[PDB]
Amino acid sequence: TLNGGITDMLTELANFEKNVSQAIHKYNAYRKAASVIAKYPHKIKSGAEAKKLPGVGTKIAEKIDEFLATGKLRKLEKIRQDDTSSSINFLTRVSGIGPSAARKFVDEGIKTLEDLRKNEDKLNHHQRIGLKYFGDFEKRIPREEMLQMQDIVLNEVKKVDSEYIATVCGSFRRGAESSGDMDVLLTHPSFTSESTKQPKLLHQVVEQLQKVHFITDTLSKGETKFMGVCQLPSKNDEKEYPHRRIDIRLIPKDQYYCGVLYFTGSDIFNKNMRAHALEKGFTINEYTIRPLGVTGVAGEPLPVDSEKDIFDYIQWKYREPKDRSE
DNA sequence: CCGACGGCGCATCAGC
DNA sequence: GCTGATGCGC
DNA sequence: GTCGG
Numbered sequence: 001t002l003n004g005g006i007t008d009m010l011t012e013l014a015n016f017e018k019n020v021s022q023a024i025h026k027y028n029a030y031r032k033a034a035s036v037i038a039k040y041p042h043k044i045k046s047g048a049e050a051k052k053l054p055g056v057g058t059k060i061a062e063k064i065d066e067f068l069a070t071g072k073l074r075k076l077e078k079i080r081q082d083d084t085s086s087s088i089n090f091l092t093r094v095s096g097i098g099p100s101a102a103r104k105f106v107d108e109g110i111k112t113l114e115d116l117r118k119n120e121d122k123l124n125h126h127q128r129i130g131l132k133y134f135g136d137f138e139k140r141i142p143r144e145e146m147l148q149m150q151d152i153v154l155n156e157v158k159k160v161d162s163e164y165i166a167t168v169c170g171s172f173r174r175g176a177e178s179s180g181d182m183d184v185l186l187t188h189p190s191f192t193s194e195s196t197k198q199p200k201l202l203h204q205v206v207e208q209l210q211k212v213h214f215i216t217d218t219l220s221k222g223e224t225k226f227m228g229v230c231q232l233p234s235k236n237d238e239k240e241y242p243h244r245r246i247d248i249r250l251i252p253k254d255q256y257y258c259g260v261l262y263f264t265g266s267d268i269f270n271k272n273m274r275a276h277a278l279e280k281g282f283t284i285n286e287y288t289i290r291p292l293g294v295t296g297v298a299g300e301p302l303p304v305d306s307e308k309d310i311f312d313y314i315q316w317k318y319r320e321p322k323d324r325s326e
Numbered sequence: 327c328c329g330a331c332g333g334c335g336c337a338t339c340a341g342c
Numbered sequence: 343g344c345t346g347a348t349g350c351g352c
Numbered sequence: 353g354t355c356g357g
């Protein structure tokens with residue numbers, strides 16, 4: 001990409017701040033800067049030029065000037081040489097192992113893949129599955145496979161009850177040619193913001209997907225959110241497809257628009273949009289958009305009849321999903 | 327200068 | 343068991 | 353780390 005060296009540097013700094021420093025606002029600041037730089041249509045010549053962008057300040061501009069002049073950043077070169085930072089950064093690549101658990105494992109002498117592989121009994125369920133599919137989870141999913149996965153999910157959901165509607169969201173809905181995982185929004189007329197008329201709505205769908213061997217493992221599961229693993233079936237003599245992460249979120253049917261806005265993302269787009277809503281006097285979650293003034297107490301849910309209605313409330317021109325990849 | 331940083335689901339734990 | 347905090351996740 | 357109040 002046009003300013004790939006710069007965005008890569010900022011992303012690595014963001015990851016260091018989240019995983020090692022345990023400084024979430026620096027992690028978010030670096031990612032916000034990387035995002036705005038990624039969409040800038042010019043090859044950046046200086047930190048001063050980048051500083052004109054919202055989210056890029058004095059310190060990142062200084063880093064951009066060093067990176068452009070030398071092709072490196074001394075701060076990262078030192079971080080890369082730090083054993084504790086390297087160990088923590090590695091451990092956090094396992095799903096379920098965050099900054100806290102990574103540092104605790106390092107303290108206990110568990111810091112390599114081999115260490116993890118002989119210490120499964122020291123991992124929780126999620127971490128154990130994250131270790132089992134360490135390599136598969138770092139592989140991307142081509143859109144062709146995402147289409148095959150979409151077919152299986154939509155068809156199996158239909159077999160359970162023709163009234164369910166499953167919508168693939170995330171990067172897929174934004175039109176990405178490759179995705180990190182599969183995000184599925186699910187609705188059923190029996191579950192609305194007013195009542196839940198049938199129990200096990202998410203459970204029956206998870207069960208059916210497990211029955212046809214599509215869903216292979218479970219990381220966490222509740223009444224409205226499933227987080228697990230799935231795998232496309234392979235043909236005779238064919239090498240198996242990698243196991244993939246899949247998230248399914250059952251949202252009240254009458255709140256589909258706020259739900260699909262949320263699940264489509266991106267994550268940075270949502271943070272940016274929700275922050276703009278706050279400045280405009282509103283608060284947005286996956287269920288509703290409500291006013292929120294100076295008193296600091298949220299009001300009643302406003303009528304939403306399209307994703308566009310949410311953008312209108314906050315005085316933003318509508319952006320198609322493909323234009324939300326921040 | 328300095329307060330705030332999007333919003334919430336599930337797993338795991340400690341206090342009562 | 344219930345509740346609220348924390349960790350990790352979307 | 354960056355921003356607006």
Ligand SMILES: Nc1ccn([C@H]2CC[C@@H](COP(=O)(O)OP(=O)(O)OP(=O)(O)O)O2)c(=O)n1
Nearest residue numbers: 170171179180181183263264265266267270352
């Ligand atoms: N911090 C987060 C993470 C996720 N999401 C929402 C928007 C994206 C959606 C699914 O999350 P991911 O699967 O992580 O995002 P993605 O855009 O689908 O990217 P990827 O292709 O890597 O799956 O959930 C969010 O609002 N806040």
Ligand SMILES: [Mg+2]
Nearest residue numbers: 170171181183
């Ligand atoms: Mg995704």
Ligand code: NA
Nearest residue numbers: 051053055056
């Ligand atoms: Na700026």
Ligand code: NA
Nearest residue numbers: 092094096097
């Ligand atoms: Na992790």
Ligand code: NA
Nearest residue numbers: 117118119120
């Ligand atoms: Na083994």
Ligand code: NA
Nearest residue numbers: 116117118119
């Ligand atoms: Na082993």
Ligand code: NA
Nearest residue numbers: 181182183247
């Ligand atoms: Na996901």
